[PDB]
Amino acid sequence: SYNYVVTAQKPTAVNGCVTGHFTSAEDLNLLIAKNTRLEIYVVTAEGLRPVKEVGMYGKIAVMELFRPKGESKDLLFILTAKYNACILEYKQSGESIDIITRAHGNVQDRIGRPSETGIIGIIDPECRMIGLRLYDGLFKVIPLDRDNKELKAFNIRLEELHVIDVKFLYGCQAPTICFVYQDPQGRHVKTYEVSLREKEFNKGPWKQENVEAEASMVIAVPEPFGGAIIIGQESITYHNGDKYLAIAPPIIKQSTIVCHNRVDPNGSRYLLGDMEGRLFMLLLEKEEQMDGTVTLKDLRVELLGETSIAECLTYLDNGVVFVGSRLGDSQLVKLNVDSNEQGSYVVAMETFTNLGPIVDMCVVDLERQGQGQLVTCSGAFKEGSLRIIRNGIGKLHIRTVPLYESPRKICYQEVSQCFGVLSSRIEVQDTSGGTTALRPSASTQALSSSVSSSKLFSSTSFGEEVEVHNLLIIDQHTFEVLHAHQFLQNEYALSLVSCKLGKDPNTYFIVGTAMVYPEEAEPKQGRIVVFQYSDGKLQTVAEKEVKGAVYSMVEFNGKLLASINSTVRLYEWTTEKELRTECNHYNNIMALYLKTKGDFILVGDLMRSVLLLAYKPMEGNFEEIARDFNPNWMSAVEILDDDNFLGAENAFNLFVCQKDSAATTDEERQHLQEVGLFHLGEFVNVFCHGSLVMQNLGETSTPTQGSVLFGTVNGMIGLVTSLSESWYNLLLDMQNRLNKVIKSVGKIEHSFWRSFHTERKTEPATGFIDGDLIESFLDISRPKMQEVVATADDLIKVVEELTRIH
């Protein structure tokens, strides 16, 4: 198998935001990291003026602006998830914009396991060095010196093997690291002086201090105050030698602080973002001394209001703050001195679209037939929404349906002209005994409502967050919630299907649930519930008690195929309108993903790769045809054709395995040979057969066959289409020839970027074509289109024929 992976929608989630003087010494820049993409903006009178979008051949893990001595303006240090490190300089010769790779190199160590709280990259205030925390028990030091032709990086052993967060302190003679670490005694704070000469750590300027158990973040307070602020779940603390201040504001206890931003250059004010979306101001009371020095008198936090759930907060200028979001839309907000009728000092100026995370999606011909439309489940919690995406002639068009709760599953019921959506809302228990909703949502504002009156499970804590699961019936035109069916107390709706079963002429909404009690962490009981939505009303038809969690559900030749924990079970729909077990498959670990094509079933396991089952209609039982013996932790699966299967794995790679054609024995026929490997760089949650392009109605013989859309955590939408061996061999030579002409920022080889990579193995990319690199041929200059060596100079006959999809 040979495939063509192309971007339909670029990642929309904001992974990191940084400010400085990169494009010019006078220009105030905003740099946004959207996974692999670096967006450069200049803060102007009109707002944010776009500069250029840098497409890195790597996931941006570290993005920091710094200015060494004598340097005209700031330099940018980038570290990728594949450990490619670079120092970048912005150059503009009138109209010609160029990014210079000052220093490049890979900083991966064969030894060392990646750390729990992931890659951390810090730069010394005096720009004496770069400090990397990649692996447990190691601190990488990159000395900053332009005099030598090489930047000789070295590791210093860190006794504290479980580091939570680290910062370089200000006002120090020698570079000093301050860090929070975990050990059996709990969490603590520690300091170390870094010696570039001896290549070791020296005694820290201030002794070990016992910090809060949930102390997650370290703030390096600039040169006037000095020291470090530590933020936990219940408290905020300041530390600078013998100086110590701790505050326990009951307001911050409700939700975890996840991001911070220094507002004032001296460090008097800090913005603090909540998991709830709440915005805070941390105030550091100044204390001017006769010596000329300054100390900290007090600490105070003030609630400013609400924003989108922030990943990164960034003060820009004149009270304007950039709210970088990954679970919702990003925003430009205004901090006003006067509060509104609600009591909020924050006012939204602009909203920027984020489709991510895409947890589920479906392809439907909504407005007119033949023209496909994507209907996704987007965001999480108060940022939860439905996004209707289409290729609109007069590029991509997005309609937002806010739900103010987490959308989970989506299916379409054409006969009912509506969508069946699974949703979860967070409810907190009060002194009343019963739980109360934090804010109104799609499940509480529905026109008609119903509660599960099931008695099947015949035989709570204050402040504790509980999930309330509902099946929402949404109109396809208005996108109004017609009905909301609340499932049982502690019941979690996991899977959803819309189909006709057996000889029954009615189309049903089928929901696979799981009981989640606070007492037990394991799913030991669930239900499969059959509902019918008629003339405005939703009715419960049947229920079947299962001995676990109903992870996946697929209609299978008029039968209901379901995955209950490690079991793959087939059900029949009786004339008594009940579900009856036909056959079972038990050889699984966590059967989370199921796909069907004819009598064949593709089983995706969370821990044990993929398995192919064939249902035998004569024997009325399953047969394990083939297995992918390779270890893979799966995120999503898809059936490309009868003998080729597409898989998405936890290390953001794509794979394709096929039934062995040169297999002679029965054992060799049971082996699924991986014939396609590609590093996508995205975490795929859903695969869909579909196109956003019109059926035919005037079309020519396409170079590609098949059409598989996919949704990712970053909001990226992509297509996978199968190619011919002739088309693949043509585009493969083209891809390698384009790499000799198309240069790479940070000098990262494209072949390296696209290589299948895991903590166990690294193999080159095979059976896959990077559609984005091939399509970049239309954007380069005519004299540089010299990648063609036997004639047909105008290769625009191809590439433009490839852009025709999406």
């Binding site: 064969r110 060392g112 028990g137 490690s566 044990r608 062995d660 955590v713």
Partner: protein, 426 residues
């Protein structure tokens, strides 16, 4: 406070962060009783189940057949079984370990897997003490001064397909390398994590030397060759189908010994040996500050401190019992005393050259037991290794399998496949 599995799965969908490291505090997803997956039940031979392979596809076991013929000579077999969750285990390979070997005492055997090289496994076997040259009614009786070490490298069953060139079953990488050496007191320590830190290479401490043994297979492609040594002893040998004495074989018997020119599949056996006494004398002569005071050395103990497979460097510590004249200070007569010291030496596997890293000071033994000296020296090595410990990536570790059910240390309770969260309950 342990979280619900479904809350964790919900977090994966919105974060894009899925890993075994993240789920480490989660209980096993599936537990199978050995009884329910084993065939021919009631008393199915002497199968001592060792554990899972790194890939999680094979479950390994072994047999120790004593054979009551009065004299009793032990026979050891290694088995590979295909695992399939709730389905019964299927035997894929039955191999005999240490062929033509007179095993007088029950060996403690350990099966090891290399960090990334999955094509072959290594089996270490050792007795408590060597069998003598005498007999005392009840039994053979042991030699308290010697111990036997048996080392066998066996090829792992192919993942499937290729080399259908059967010409009648048997295959191409169905090779077996096996060796045997004797050790003296203080009996060298067993360090499988370090001895196998470099793929296809095993470091062996024979009391008198450190032997680096590389076993590799090559097709008639001239692209690759020599990992050991790109002066001290080096021996390279070639073998085709149809100093530590290593006798090669197929899955049953001997292959033809060939020389370079052979066009087809070929095996290579390399051995780089470092002589301890030469190293000790060279360090004292050129780098020890007390080298003038030195007379002779009574005994030595070598412990590996680190193996760097990227730079092909082996860091060893040498515990030395020696005789030396005390400091030139005159407090009467200056008779040579017995001292203990330690020398740190870095051995380059590419050049074969060794470099002095550290030379310890002379410490007076003052009527201590030789055992007390070696025990204290080995505690100092454990201390150093533990102190400089840096956690490594999973799937780069050395899989060490043991089941001392027959060695009064009692049987194992669980055989776990941690990456798939699967337990075989014995």
């Amino acid at each position: 406070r342990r979280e619900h599995v479904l809350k964790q799965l919900e977090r994966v969908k919105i974060s894009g962060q899925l890993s075994p490291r993240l789920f480490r505090k989660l209980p096993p997803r599936v537990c199978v009783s050995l009884k329910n997956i084993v065939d021919e039940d009631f008393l199915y031979a002497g199968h001592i189940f060792l554990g899972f392979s790194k890939c999680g596809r094979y479950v390994l076991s072994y047999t120790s057949s004593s054979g009551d013929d009065d004299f009793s000579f032990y026979i050891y077999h290694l088995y590979w079984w295909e695992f399939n969750v709730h389905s019964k285990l299927k035997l894929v390979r039955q191999v005999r370990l240490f062929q033509d070997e007179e095993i007088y005492s029950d060996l403690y055997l350990t099966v090891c897997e290399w960090p990334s090289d999955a094509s072959k496994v290594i089996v270490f076997g050792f007795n408590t003490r060597s069998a003598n040259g005498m007999l005392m009614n009840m039994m053979m009786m042991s030699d308290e001064n010697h111990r036997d070490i048996y080392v066998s490298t066996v090829a792992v069953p192919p993942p499937g397909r290729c080399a259908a060139c059967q010409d009648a079953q048997c295959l191409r990488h169905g090779f077996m390398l096996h060796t045997k050496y004797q050790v003296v007191y203080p009996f060298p320590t067993f360090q499988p994590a370090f001895q196998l830190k470099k793929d296809q290479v095993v470091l062996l401490n024979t009391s008198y030397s450190l032997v680096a043994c590389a076993v590799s297979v090559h097709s008639a492609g001239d692209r690759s060759f020599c990992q050991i040594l790109y002066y001290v002893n080096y021996t390279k040998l070639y073998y085709v189908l149809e100093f530590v004495v290593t006798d090669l074989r197929g899955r049953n018997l001997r292959p033809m010994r060939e020389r370079t020119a052979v066009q087809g599949q070929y095996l290579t056996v390399e051995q780089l040996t470092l002589d301890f006494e030469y190293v000790i004398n060279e360090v004292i002569r050129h780098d020890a500050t007390w080298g003038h005071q030195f007379c002779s050395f009574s005994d030595y103990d070598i412990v590996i401190l680190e193996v760097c497979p990227e730079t092909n460097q082996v860091l060893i510590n040498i515990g030395l019992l020696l005789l030396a004249f005390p400091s030139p200070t005159e407090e009467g007569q200056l008779r040579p005393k017995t001292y203990h010291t330690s020398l740190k030496v870095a051995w380059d596997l590419n050049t074969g050259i060794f470099e002095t890293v550290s030379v310890g000071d002379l410490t007076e033994v003052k009527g201590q037991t030789s055992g007390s000296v070696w025990s204290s020296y080995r505690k100092s090595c454990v201390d150093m290794v533990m102190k400089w410990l840096v956690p490594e990536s999973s799937g780069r570790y050395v899989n060490r399998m043991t089941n001392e059910a027959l060695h009064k240390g009692c049987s194992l309770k669980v055989l776990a496949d941690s990456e798939r969260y699967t337990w075989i309950v014995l």
